Amino acid sequence: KVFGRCELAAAMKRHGLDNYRGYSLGNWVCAAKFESNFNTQATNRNTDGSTDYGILQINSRWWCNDGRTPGSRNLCNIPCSALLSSDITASVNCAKKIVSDGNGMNAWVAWRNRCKGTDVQAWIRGCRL
Ligand SMILES: [Cl-]
Ligand SMILES: [Cl-]
Ligand SMILES: [Cl-]
Ligand SMILES: [Cl-]
Ligand SMILES: [Cl-]
Ligand SMILES: [Cl-]
Ligand SMILES: [Cl-]
Ligand code: NA
Description:
The chain is mostly helical.
């Protein structure tokens, strides 16, 4: 599913992401835009042989099992295909584990390079939340 900006903001708000560990809703929308272009089916293969899955490009080296990333962890306890669902619940629940892990949203390279220190409130401007 390719989400609209406000549609996704509303879904993330309902799943408890607004101010989760201090990150306003605009941070999560900005990250999703630059990670996946708001497409739940996005996959990208890394040089190391790991793959990034879904709206928040969660990586198979640590967070999910795809059956092809040798000596990987599955810290979210989900198949990586669960992250491509039109229901963002599995992605959100896994993202909450990631952002609690010590590096905050710096775990998302596109958030660090394209969202951090920008006016992220602009991503939810105009939305009925
Ligand atoms: Cl947009
Ligand atoms: Cl915000
Ligand atoms: Cl594997
Ligand atoms: Cl594991
Ligand atoms: Cl699994
Ligand atoms: Cl959803
Ligand atoms: Cl933090
Ligand atoms: Na894995």
